[PDB]
Ligand binder design. Structure first.
Ligand code: CL
Ligand code: ZN
Ligand code: ZN
Ligand code: ZN
Length: 213
C-alpha cells in the first residue's frame, strides 16, 4: 500500500511558549506497522529553549501505531491525502498548550508541519524551570464523534524528585478524505527522550504505540 513498512519522517515545528518563539526541524524514521519511530530534532531558532522539552515531544503521527487487523486504521487509510490533528494539553495550574499539525506524504516519507502555542505556565513551575523528567506510559481512548476521530489521555508529567503533575490531552484527528471508521478502542503509548545535549538543542525522541480493543 502507500504506507510502507519503513517510512522516513521530516518535520518542522514553529512555536511560542510563554511568548518565547522557536523553530525546530526534525528528521527520523519508523516502522508504521510495528508502531515505532525515532526522530532527531535540532533547534534552529530560539535556542536555548527556556522551558521543558517534554511539552514538545508528543507534538513531534498516529500512522506509527501497531493495530490489530480487526480494528480499522483511521490514520493509515487516510494516505496518501493524509490527515491533520489539533490538540489541547491542559496542565493542573493554568498552563495550556494548543497544537495543530498537518501530516502529509511524499513517496516513502511523511512530512509534519507543526504549530504549537503554550501559554500561562507559572514562571516558577516545573515546565518553565525545566524540572520535568518525562512522561509516564499512557493509554489514549479513541472514539468517533462528529464523524472524526477523538482521542483523550490523562498523563503524568514526571518531575525531578519523583513526583508528577497531571496533564489532560484532548485531540481531534481529521482525515482529509472519507475512510472506514473504527469502533471505540485504545492506544497504549510510551515516549522517551533517548538522548539530548545539555540544553536540548539536539534531541532524539523514541515513541511506541499499540492499539487494542
Ligand atoms: Cl525518504
Ligand atoms: Zn495480521
Ligand atoms: Zn524517500
Ligand atoms: Zn529509556
Amino acid at each position: 500500500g502507500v504506507i510502507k513498512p519503513d517510512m522516513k519522517i521530516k518535520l518542522k515545528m514553529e512555536g511560542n511558549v510563554n511568548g518565547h518563539a522557536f523553530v525546530i526541524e526534525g528528521e527520523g524514521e519508523g516502522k508504521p506497522y510495528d508502531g515505532t519511530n525515532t526522530i532527531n530534532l535540532e533547534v534552529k531558532e530560539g535556542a536555548p529553549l527556556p522551558f521543558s522539552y517534554d511539552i514538545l515531544t508528543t507534538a513531534f503521527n498516529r500512522a506509527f501505531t501497531k493495530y490489530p487487523d480487526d480494528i480499522p486504521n483511521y490514520f493509515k487509510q487516510s494516505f496518501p491525502e493524509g490527515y491533520s490533528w489539533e490538540r489541547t494539553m491542559t496542565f493542573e495550574d493554568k498552563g495550556i498548550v494548543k497544537v495543530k499539525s498537518d501530516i502529509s506524504m511524499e513517496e516513502d516519507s511523511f512530512i509534519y508541519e507543526i504549530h504549537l502555542k503554550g501559554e500561562n505556565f507559572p514562571p516558577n513551575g516545573p515546565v518553565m524551570q525545566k524540572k520535568t523528567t518525562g512522561w509516564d506510559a499512557s493509554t489514549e481512548r479513541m472514539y468517533v464523534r462528529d464523524g472524526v476521530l477523538k482521542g483523550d489521555v490523562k498523563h503524568k508529567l514526571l518531575l525531578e524528585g519523583g513526583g508528577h503533575h497531571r496533564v489532560d490531552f484532548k485531540t481531534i484527528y481529521r482525515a482529509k478524505k472519507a475512510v472506514k471508521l473504527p469502533d471505540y478502542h485504545f492506544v497504549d503509548h510510551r515516549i522517551e527522550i533517548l538522548n539530548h545535549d545539555k540544553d536540548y538543542n539536539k534531541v532524539t525522541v523514541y515513541e511506541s504505540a499499540v492499539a487494542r480493543n
